[PDB]
C-alpha cells in the first residue's frame, strides 16, 4: 500500500509553523469583531449588588481614569445607555445601567451583554435575598465575561492595612460564585481602574451559547412608520451581534412577543422578506394534517373488566337469562332456582398549608386512594388501566381520549430533536443575510396599540432577538427541573409557574416526572416536585432549538424583586413520545393467614368490584407479588395467593394507571 513516515527536523518545524500561523489567522479573524474604529460594540452592563451603591459612580471612575471629563459631564444630564469610544485602546464600548427596582430588567440587561461588571460594597454586606439572587440567576441564565469591582473601599478606615482586609474577604466571597476570577479590582486606585478599563477594551468576551446562535440587536434608535391605520413598521437602528438575522425568520422582543419582519437594510444593501416567510401562528395548520391516523379509539364503556386484556383473563361472557317468578315475596336465590333453562391572604394561607400537608402526605403515602363503602370502585376507576410492568407493556402516544387537549393533533411533531436542532442551526448559519458586526435598520410589522408601552432606547434597554425555524410553533416540551437553593416550599404539577428560556417567558402548568429512561418511554406522574433530585417538567409550549437554560419562577408582589425564584434547569426535548401515567394505588390489610392463602380486608366493599379487578396483580411494600382468588363475603373480603409469607404488618396494594395530558401555555408580560 503506502510506505511509512520519518518526519525530519524541517517537516516538524513546518507543520508547527503552519499550525500556529493558522491559529493566529483564525484568532485575528475572531478578534476582528471589535475593530474599535468603525465596527465594534462591546456591551458592558453595570450591576451593583448593594442597595446603597451608585452605578453612575462606577462608570464615572472608569471613564475619569480615561482622562475624559467631557464624556462624563455629557452623560450626567440625561442618559442610562452610552456609546463611549475610548481612544487609549481604540475601542467602541456600549455601557448599560439597569433599572435596579426591576429584577427582570437586570436579568434582561445582563443577558444581552458581552461583559458583566459587579459592584461590591466595602461598607454593606451583600443581601442574601436580593443581590445574592442576582448573582445566582445571572449565572444560571447565562453570563459572558464577568468582573468583580469595588468603589466603597475608601469609606472604611483611611489606612490601607484595614482596607485590604475588606478587599480580600470580598475576593473570597466573589470567588465562591465566580471561581474563574481571583482578583476583585479596586477602582479607588488608579492602577486597577486603568487595568479593568484596559481589559474591557482589549480582552475578547466569551460566548453564551443560546444568545449567540440566534443573533441579537441592541437598539440605539427606535422610530415608527405608519402604513395602515391599525398597524405599521417599527424601525430599529442597531448593530447585529451573534449569528445574524434573516428576513424570513421571526424576531422576538421581550415583554412584547414574537413578530415577523418586513424589511432589513444595512449601513456598515436592502433585503425584503418574500414568500419564504415564517408565519405568525402557533398551531400550524399542517400539524392537523400530520396527525391523521388515529390508532386506538378504545371504548371503556364496552368493558366488563379492567382494561388489561393484554396480560389478564379472557373476555368472560355473562348471557343473562332473567325470568320472573311470581311467588309474592321471594329471595333472589329461590328465583335463581325456578326458571333455569339449559340448551386574599387567608385564602393563600389555608390553601398553602393544605398543599404542604398533601405533599408530606404524598411522601409518607405515595399515590394511594381511599375508597368509601358507598363508592362504586368500578365506576370510580373505570377509565383506568392496570398494566403489570409500567416500563414493559405497550402504552401509546396516538390514543384518542376526551381528556386529551383539543390542540393535541395540531402540534409540531419533530421526529428527532438532536438532529433537527443541528440541521436548522446550520441552515440559519448558511442562510444568514446579515452577519455579526453589521449596522442595521430593521423594519418590523407591528400592531399600533402597543406603541404606548415602548420606552426610550437610552433610558431603557431595547433588545431585538432572533428566532429560528418553527420556534413560534407550539410543541410538547420536556424541561429539566431542579429546585433553587434554600427553597423548601411545595410545588404541585398543575399550578401556573412562569418559565424563562431564551429570553422568552411563558406561564406553565407543567407535569412533573422522573426522567428515568424507559424502553416504552412511559414515566410516573409525580404530583409534587421531588425535594432532592433533578426532575422533568412537560408541557405544551413553543419550541426552543438551542437548549436554552430555563428559570422557573412565580411572580410574588410582596418581595423586593417581584419574583419568587422557584427552580432552574434546561430545555431538554421537543418530544411527544413521552407519555405520563398517573398511578393510583389501592390499599388493603391482610386479615387472615393460611399456609398458602391469605384473606385480605378493606380494599373493596362489593364482590362485583373484586370480580372487576381480578386480573390486576397485587404487590406488597414488603416487596412481594401475588394475585386474587375469589370473593369471600358480601362485604368485599377477598382471598389471595402470594410469593412469600406475609404478616398483618404488610400492606397489599393495587397499581392502576391513567393517561395524563400536557397543558396549553400562554406568554407572560410585565
Amino acid at each position: 500500500g503506502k510506505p511509512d513516515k520519518q518526519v525530519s527536523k524541517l517537516q516538524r518545524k513546518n507543520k508547527a509553523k503552519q499550525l500556529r500561523a493558522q491559529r493566529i489567522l483564525d484568532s485575528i479573524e475572531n478578534r476582528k469583531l471589535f475593530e474599535g474604529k468603525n465596527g465594534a460594540a462591546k456591551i458592558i452592563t453595570i450591576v451593583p449588588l448593594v442597595n446603597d451603591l451608585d452605578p453612575l459612580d462606577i462608570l464615572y471612575k472608569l471613564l475619569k481614569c480615561a482622562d475624559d471629563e467631557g464624556i462624563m459631564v455629557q452623560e450626567v444630564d440625561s442618559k442610562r445607555i452610552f456609546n463611549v469610544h475610548i481612544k487609549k485602546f481604540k475601542s467602541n464600548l456600549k455601557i448599560i445601567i439597569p433599572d435596579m427596582t426591576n429584577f427582570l430588567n437586570i436579568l434582561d440587561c445582563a443577558k444581552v451583554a458581552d461583559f458583566v461588571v459587579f459592584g461590591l460594597s466595602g461598607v454593606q454586606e451583600v443581601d442574601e435575598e436580593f443581590g445574592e439572587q442576582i448573582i445566582r440567576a445571572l449565572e444560571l441564565q447565562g453570563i459572558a465575561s464577568y468582573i468583580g469591582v469595588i468603589s466603597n473601599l475608601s469609606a472604611v478606615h483611611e489606612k490601607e492595612k484595614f482596607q485590604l482586609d475588606v478587599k480580600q474577604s470580598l475576593e473570597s466571597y466573589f470567588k465562591h460564585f465566580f471561581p474563574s476570577e481571583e482578583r476583585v479590582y479596586n477602582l479607588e486606585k488608579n492602577s486597577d481602574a486603568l487595568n479593568v478599563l484596559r481589559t474591557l477594551c482589549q480582552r475578547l468576551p466569551r460566548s453564551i451559547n443560546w444568545r449567540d446562535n440566534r443573533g441579537y440587536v441592541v437598539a440605539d434608535f427606535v422610530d415608527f412608520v405608519e402604513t395602515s391605520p391599525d398597524s405599521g413598521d417599527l424601525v430599529i437602528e442597531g448593530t447585529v451581534r451573534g449569528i445574524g438575522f434573516n428576513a424570513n425568520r421571526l424576531v422576538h422582543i421581550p415583554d412584547f412577543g414574537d413578530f415577523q419582519l418586513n424589511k432589513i437594510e444595512k449601513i456598515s444593501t436592502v433585503f425584503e422578506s418574500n414568500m419564504n416567510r415564517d408565519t405568525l401562528d402557533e398551531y400550524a395548520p399542517e400539524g392537523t394534517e400530520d396527525w391523521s391516523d388515529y390508532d386506538e379509539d378504545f371504548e371503556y364503556d364496552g368493558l366488563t373488566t379492567a382494561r388489561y386484556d393484554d396480560h389478564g383473563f379472557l373476555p368472560g361472557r355473562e348471557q343473562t337469562s332473567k325470568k320472573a317468578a311470581v311467588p309474592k315475596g321471594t329471595s333472589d336465590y329461590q328465583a335463581k332456582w325456578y326458571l333455569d333453562d339449559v340448551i386574599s391572604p387567608e385564602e393563600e394561607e389555608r390553601q398553602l398549608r393544605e398543599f404542604r400537608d398533601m405533599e408530606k402526605e404524598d411522601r409518607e403515602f405515595p399515590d394511594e386512594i381511599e375508597l368509601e363503602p358507598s363508592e362504586s370502585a368500578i365506576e370510580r376507576l373505570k377509565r383506568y388501566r392496570g398494566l403489570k410492568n409500567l416500563y414493559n407493556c405497550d402504552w401509546q402516544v396516538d390514543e384518542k381520549d376526551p381528556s386529551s387537549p383539543a390542540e393535541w393533533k395540531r402540534l409540531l411533531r419533530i421526529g428527532n430533536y438532536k438532529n433537527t436542532k443541528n440541521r436548522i442551526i446550520k441552515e440559519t448559519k448558511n442562510e444568514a443575510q446579515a452577519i455579526a458586526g453589521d449596522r442595521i435598520r430593521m423594519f418590523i410589522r407591528f400592531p399600533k396599540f402597543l406603541l404606548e408601552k415602548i420606552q426610550d432606547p437610552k433610558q431603557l434597554l431595547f433588545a431585538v432577538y432572533g428566532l429560528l425555524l418553527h420556534e413560534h410553533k407550539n410543541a410538547v416540551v420536556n424541561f429539566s427541573l431542579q429546585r433553587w437553593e434554600q427553597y423548601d416550599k411545595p410545588v404541585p404539577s398543575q399550578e401556573p409557574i412562569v418559565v424563562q428560556y431564551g429570553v422568552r417567558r411563558y406561564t406553565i402548568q407543567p407535569l412533573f416526572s422522573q426522567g428515568s429512561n424507559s424502553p416504552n418511554n412511559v414515566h410516573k406522574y409525580e404530583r409534587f416536585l421531588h425535594p432532592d433530585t433533578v426532575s422533568v417538567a412537560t408541557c405544551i409550549a413553543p419550541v426552543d432549538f438551542t437548549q436554552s437554560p430555563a428559570i422557573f419562577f412565580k411572580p410574588s408582589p410582596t418581595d423586593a424583586k417581584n419574583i419568587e425564584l422557584i427552580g432552574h434547569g434546561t430545555f431538554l426535548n421537543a418530544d411527544h413520545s413521552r407519555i405520563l401515567a398517573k398511578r393510583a394505588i389501592l390499599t388493603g390489610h391482610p386479615f387472615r393467614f393460611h399456609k398458602t392463602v391469605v384473606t385480605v380486608r378493606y380494599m373493596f366493599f362489593r364482590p362485583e368490584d373484586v370480580e372487576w379487578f381480578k386480573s390486576i396483580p397485587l404487590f406488597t411494600k414488603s416487596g412481594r407479588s401475588g394475585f386474587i382468588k375469589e370473593s369471600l363475603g358480601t362485604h368485599g373480603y377477598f382471598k389471595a395467593t402470594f410469593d412469600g409469607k406475609l404478616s398483618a404488618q404488610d400492606v397489599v396494594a393495587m397499581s392502576l394507571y391513567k393517561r395524563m395530558w400536557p397543558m396549553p401555555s400562554l406568554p407572560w408580560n410585565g
Binding site: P315, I343, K388, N392, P617, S625, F627
Partner: protein
Amino acid sequence: KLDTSHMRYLTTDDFRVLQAVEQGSRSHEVVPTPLIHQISGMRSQSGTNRAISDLAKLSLISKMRNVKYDGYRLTYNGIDYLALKTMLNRDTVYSVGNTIGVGKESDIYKVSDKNGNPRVMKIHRLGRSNQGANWMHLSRLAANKEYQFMSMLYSKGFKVPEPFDNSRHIVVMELIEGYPMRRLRKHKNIPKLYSDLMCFIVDLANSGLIHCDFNEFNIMIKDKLEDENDCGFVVIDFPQCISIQHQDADYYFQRDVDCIRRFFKKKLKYEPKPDSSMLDTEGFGD
C-alpha cells in the same frame, strides 16, 4: 407437578435468564453461575441473580454446589414454562387449568387462546423426578413424534384431534365435545357408526398403521347437533400404533376388530352381518 399460575409472576428478565440456563444445560451438564452470568447477555449480578432467586424460589431451578463446583439444575417446571413462554410468544395459549386425562407418559389439561376457543394440552412426562438428559430429551422426542403422527392423521382426513402446536414435550390440540364408549348409552344409527369404525381401521391399515389398542375408552364421539344428532368418531392412539410390516401386525389388527364387534355386541346389542375385515385384505390394500 404443574402449577401454571406461578408463571405470571415472572418478568421479561426472569424468562431471559431461564432461557439462558436452557441454552447452558443443553451445552454443558450442570450450568455454573458464571456460565449463566456470561451467556444470559445481561448487565450485572443484579438482574441475573435476582432472576435466579425468583426461579429457585418458584422451583424452576436447583442449586448444585458440588465441592466448589457451583452449578444449577433445570427442573421440569422450567422446561414447562419455557415451552409455555414460547407459546405465549407464538400466540397459541393464553390460559390453562382443568385436568381431564392423567396418562402415564402424558398429562392432559384444558386450555384457551386469545380468542376464547377451548383447547387441550398434552405435556409428556417420561419418568415422574430424577432428571437426567434422557427423561427430558425423550419426552421432547415423544411429543415431537405424537404431533407429527397427529398432523399426518388430520391431513389425510381421519377423525383425529387437529394438532395445533408442539412446544417441545408439550402439545396443543383441539378440544372435542365428545364422549367415550363408556359414557355413551345408546345411538340412533348404530350400524352406520360401526360401518364408520370399521372403514376407519380399513383406511388406517391402508395408510400403513395398526393402532394396536382400539378399546372403548380410546374412541371419543363428538356431537355437533342436538336436533339432528350428528356424530364424529375421534381416536387417541399413536405411541401404541404398530406399523403394517411388524411381525405381530396380524392379531393386533384382528384384536382391534374383535374389540369393535364385542363392544358393539354388548353395549348396543348390534352384531355385524358382514364378515370382519381380516389382516390379509389390508395387507394388500396398502
